Symmetry: D2
Subunit: 509 residues, 4 copies
């Protein structure tokens, strides 16, 4: 019976500036006349509302308006750009509950995590305000008398941002706050299945830009599929392409960007491992493992996919994790009791079922889960599988679903090697009390991941540090440390200010 | 007339450990059984000596010996690796004259510049010794009580280095010193036309490694053509590929490395512009322009290719540069009088003649030069061409030859735009006395190059700063600032050291 | 005619939580039973309201409560402390107008500048939020195998802050935001003549701390004179004393802190010089000079005291500045476009008159001003004096009053030397178009000040950079760059995590 | 019989350029006509040779020559200054054995440690070479359009260096290498009892300066007592005074420098504690404790003075350390068998005997040692004392002698507090396997020292990190991290390069 938005139960969606049909293009003015997409709530498969995506011609026009906006934007001092970013942070803060609710409704993650995602954007904005007075390179001492030597950083220009479904607000945010602070203009193509969240966020940002008499095209949005995404990847006018998504798609995009010598920031797949040693605090391990695997229905890029247990504690730990799995409250994402919601799409359910099959075929035993739940929505049981070899093809594959593969190990050398043997390289954790092991894990013969944690799971990450992975995860970094450098171009500048002339070396002038 | 090396006039070549035939593979032991190449002296087209290049199977075996060497090398503390780099610096210092002489003989650049190139390696070694006690990331304050947060840097593993002909010692050096300091092992494939220099350098480095009882494979070398170069680009065991060469070849290599998610450092073509404004010190401009254009026979990646003169000074400056060109002493590279030697190959001579032709077809007038010199060796006249449009196809192309294209401009906006309009983005210079112009040139609406100079030519660059370009020049950086980061992998590490347990949130454990 | 606060025209003072009598001590609870001081409005010499200052015993008790608060505060992660600092920023933002108005009423500076001062605190808070995720030292590579080497930064403990009258909000703010972010607790003794501003600020901060269930003693205040100030200087429990004030008082305090090996941050006197060269843009010079000299009635520590004019432009510039001085409209602190108010106290008026007489006795000629204005308040005429020798005793003295001493120079060497010859070393400016001169001025044979400006006056300074002087100005730095390090203690930490034992060297164990 | 230098067994002293009488002043030329001091070998109380110290008038003249040398030296680019530092490093390297031998002969430490000290100078030189291309501040983004903002670092001028007896080469070296790299000139007053080492070093440095046609006054030396030292402390021409010595003398010097607003670097006393917890590796603890206490005859500023043992391991550990003490080979410093030489002076022996007395009076029991050894030289037995209270006056005092006070503790809180309770704050160590304890020790409620070590003793320190202490140790830092900043002055520079004029705000110009 109709779109959710038309029902009174859902009229809070109107506070986000959303309607039955929504324009999917913003570039200072709203529009869009491409394919009309209908966004479904994964909790009950009911349609929420529609978004009209961009045509290539509308993308084309958006890039021109963006390029033009950059001209005036790049001329605004960085601390003054930070003032804009600060206000974006505040505008978001005001709408945190309803925006969090939309994320929960459209993506499927629990309400508190929807709110948490909005907070990530808010917090990275405040961080960026700090950076706006800091970004730059060293003044260096030249070897030449009467010469100044400085390292300059400047905006790359336009930052294209392609994001994944699972974090429809935060990923954009992490990129937006930094890119803006760095004097760039953004163009955003969110995941096709979360266009309402894209529009809602763009609405909040657009209003701030407009309050401040700035061209709206500084933060443009064009919703669409591979369609538009490919155009961005091939577009010479896109100075930096930030891609967050599958490692399969990322590769296609990377190759296209490389082809035209563009800059890229790649945030791709993970196959994240928790390694539990004999001396680990098991009272810490068990809840850590559960929440890291089960959270967001196994749909964070940082979700634990591989749990390696030392032979001495293997059977005891598995059983305890299994006892916890039984108490994982599955239900409506809006319900404060719910810890675990639906998978994002029906295709996701199919991957889940297929991965279950392959696991069995490869010698896996199901400890629990494995079945599609008999109810509205894309609900599947959180699954634990023991018995597979460390290099079973399915274990080496990222399947974006709540399945946890349990591995049994003996030596430290083994576990470390198995952690590293896969093609992904996002996140990693060991649980241990051993001082030497901690630093070995952190050193050159330890983990090969971008995130390397000790006694905290694979999803433990904060704004202050650089976020991203290695190998097939793509190399890119977001948010903390000197991540900003990816959004700017370095120039090594020598200024001769002396009256000294170069040696004539035999020639008369 | 035989090989030069057999003649007494050239027995100093034996001090570099060189013989009639030379092994082109080193990996802890010397060998090679691939194609035998004969290295010619471009000053007289006489054969110097031969080098036996690697077979794929010998490359293959070198990669395994390299990987094995890394194991022990990565375990050596960075300051202690720096001690090795220090000694390489000193070993080079002892052989500076003869090695400089070999560069001059085999590449074709003047003796003093051959010596200067060796000095670059020496100086970057001493710089690396400093870095060996410095490399690393920040300790960061975690938002979580009882949690440490640190940024760790670790060796990427094996660094493949492919170098160009024009700087056969320095480019390898810049990479070697840094990579070694950073706990990596190197594999070097030098330009096919400079294998004797490759071998000579490798010999010097090998001896130091051996004096210190270190596996020689830490600094491996396999000489060869596209053959081996492609193998490296495709090899998953090469953790970072550093490529210095043409932007055409770089692309092929880049695409191959991207395909397999490897790390790349790209140091490609340039189309470097000097912009002379009305208020410029012409007594500084004239000698600067001459030496920057004519030096190394127009064969530095940083060589001035485009000289933009303000209409008010155009005709006066061109004429003065032309008067200087007449006094450029052309001769034997070994001869201390010579300022200008031969082009590196005969093919180079053909590019030169072809570019002359295209320049004429596109409306160019030859101010001077343009003719192959009637004498032994690959000698061509240093050429100046006026009258071409800023966007004449030939002007936008890097031709690695001593031709200088002269452009006439009026507005600052014009000159800046023309500097940026090309696909290359290595080096750039303006000559002016205007305070505001200087900073605009350095800012966001100024030069888009990696090197952005004021009142010093396009080849003004020192160790202390990052070296490299933007756009089609490839993005890579060498030597100074935080260039070292490209040779290492970042990991964001969170250590939970507290006894705190995570909230149970309704679940009983 | 009673207290101003009791009159309806001034009831906005009640919005700041102010009353007829006000407690001058806060340490989690309010009080004070020392001397009752009456704060006068320097615009009309009318009493505003009273503040009860601290007794030594109440200072004593405040230090204990502060030390106790630190225990819990130091345990809170830096980003979480930044969240507190963020809220202080916001709380201030809400009260910006009334607080600015109080500064204007109690100190005497114009309304817009009162508001500007509050903004400084607000902006430094947002800066500190950035720092809260950044502060720390490098992870360093140890020369010892299996050893970690890190630089740790930790709170010094309690930061005592003694501030001057002229910036009663901002100076405290610059210190508060950073110290808090760095895990310190603060104790504030503001200038005796601005206790209402001290209380008002403390009230705003106290409320934020209390909203967040934090001990109020984290930001303690004890109002008083030299009395309390000396106690702080001598108190071993004060880990860092930040002193902003006269260089005469600063010295006494410094000596006392040195005596007990405490840490000190000194922000003392200035004798700031503007040097105008022949090629300067005079249309820029004239307004710059006027506003830098006349602003805040010559009562900024950065105020231009010495204006050095090249002989060629001397008489023309003086006359133009004089024409501008005539249009400097004296009005009332609040008001619309009042550009100039009263001196802070009557004693200030006496210094002004005495400095005038000494100037005359030392050969000075009054171009304008010099007379006490016949009206309510501490109003004096803005004065220009020509003819004095560069080393006339009065010129070398900081008199905190709106007198501008004009010097005539010829050579660059002269001007630079005269700038440096004084004992103060806060701020300095040159106005010129000469590229070489700019960098000479910035280099080792240029200015010896902490602030070294080009084509901007002596009061040009922003949050992003470190603020402070050299020589008799005291060495301290506030706000930007790595100023934070003064508020923390560095520790060089080596962690041995290996099983390696030290060489027995002949001894059996 | 007679001076040692005249005997053939000691003619290697002539290789250092030493003679019977030696000039104690160098400032480009050698001389000195003050008090003639005779330097005695503490191993046999035999006179080595004489040095003629400076008169005040000769100090005075040396300061003028130094100031004059600075003019030309400050004009030399930092990397080119580093080239000088590099050569100093090499000149030292050539003389390492004989210079090490002199340290051993004149100070009394064992030969291998004399050599090690020279190596510290050599290694810090190479470090400084790296820094010579790195030193400087950030380029910062200004909030003002068309304004550049940069942090500049410049030489302070002349660095006065006053050193202690115990490290007569290295302390100077650590200061020399950095100060020179930073464009300062040095004046050195070494300890009165080690003037031959001072002269020998100065000779090596002087030669390098002269080889390079630089004024010798860049590295001046004036030998003398409190006499000259006080003059330096009071001298306004000394821009920075670096003092290494007793905390008693340091205070006098500090107070004098503070009085005249000079810069100071203080490296004073230590009372260094090793804390051994229950879970410590005792096989590591015992040899660590022995060597850290007994090394250099207890005469390093980092020497372990306090050993805190957990009650559970106390009696076992003391006994094991005592068994090791018996095997400590006491003898001639020149003999390769010797691990432990003489105390530096006879007064030192008296302090030792007096501290023994006070320890007994305060309830201490001698485990071993306590007696003057019956032999030539200042030899005393290495002493261990148990039973004293943590706050026994003698334990809180630094006595520069080989006595180790053993404390028994129970709680972690206790040990940490006892470590911090003293007025010194140089070095500290804990021995433990507990992950949480390690980071608590490093954090805000851990050690309050400048050096904070884990599982390595109190003398574990390397070039890469900043070296120095807190509290009564004086705050100064040497060598690593950003220690260099203490040798330079910061300037925050704003450059307005736009044509923009400031708002007229009602005034017509």
């Amino acid at each position: 019976s109709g779109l959710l938005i038309n029902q009174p139960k859902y009229s809070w969606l109107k506070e986000l500036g959303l309607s039955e049909d929504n324009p999917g293009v913003y570039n200072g003015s709203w529009g869009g006349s491409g394919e009309v997409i209908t966004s479904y709530c994964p909790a009950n498969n009911e349609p929420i509302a529609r978004v009209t995506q961009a045509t290539l011609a509308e993308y084309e026009e958006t890039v021109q308006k963006t390029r033009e906006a950059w001209k005036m934007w790049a001329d605004i001092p960085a601390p003054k750009r930070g003032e804009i970013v600060r206000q974006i942070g505040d505008a978001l803060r005001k709408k945190i509950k309803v925006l969090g609710s939309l994320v929960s409704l459209e993506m499927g993650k629990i309400y508190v995590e929807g709110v948490g995602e909005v907070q990530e954007y808010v917090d990275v904005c405040d961080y960026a305000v700090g950076l706006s007075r800091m970004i730059g390179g060293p003044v260096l001492p030249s070897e030449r008398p009467g010469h100044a030597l400085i390292e300059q950083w400047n905006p790359v220009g336009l930052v294209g941002i392609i994001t994944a479904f699972n974090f429809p607000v935060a990923v954009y945010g992490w990129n937006n706050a930094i890119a803006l602070t760095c004097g760039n203009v953004c163009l955003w193509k969110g995941a096709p299945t979360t266009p309402l969240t894209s529009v809602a966020v763009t609405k909040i940002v657009a209003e701030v830009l407009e309050q401040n008499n700035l061209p709206g095209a500084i933060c443009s949005m064009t919703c669409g599929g591979a369609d538009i995404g490919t155009a961005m990847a091939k577009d010479e006018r896109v100075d930096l392409l930030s891609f967050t998504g599958s490692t399969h798609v990322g590769k296609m995009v990377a190759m296209m960007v490389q082809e035209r010598f563009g800059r890229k920031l790649l945030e791709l797949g993970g196959n994240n491992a928790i390694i539990v040693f004999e001396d680990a605090d098991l009272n810490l391990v068990v809840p850590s493992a559960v929440f890291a695997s089960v959270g967001t229905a196994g749909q964070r890029c940082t979700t634990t996919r591989r749990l390696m247990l030392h032979e001495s504690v293997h059977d005891a730990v598995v059983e305890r994790i299994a006892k916890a799995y039984k108490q994982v409250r599955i239900g409506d994402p809006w319900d404060p009791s719910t810890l675990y919601g639906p998978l994002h799409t029906k295709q996701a359910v199919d991957q889940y079922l297929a991965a279950i099959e392959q696991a069995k075929q490869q010698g896996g035993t199901l400890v629990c889960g494995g079945k599609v739940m008999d109810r509205p929505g894309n609900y599947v049981e959180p699954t634990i599988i023991t018995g597979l070899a460390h290099d079973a093809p399915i274990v080496h594959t990222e399947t974006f679903v709540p399945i946890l593969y349990v591995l049994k190990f003996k030596t430290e050398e083994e576990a470390f090697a198995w952690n590293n043997e896969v093609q992904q390289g996002l996140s990693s954790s060991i649980f241990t009390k051993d001082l030497g092991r901690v630093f070995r894990w952190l050193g050159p013969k330890g983990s090969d991941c971008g995130i390397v944690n000790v006694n905290i799971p694979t999803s433990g990450a904060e704004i202050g540090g650089a976020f991203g992975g290695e190998k097939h995860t793509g190399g890119g970094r977001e948010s903390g440390s000197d991540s900003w450098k990816q959004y700017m171009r370095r120039s090594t500048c020598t200024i001769n200010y002396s009256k000294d002339l170069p040696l004539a070396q035999g020639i008369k002038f």
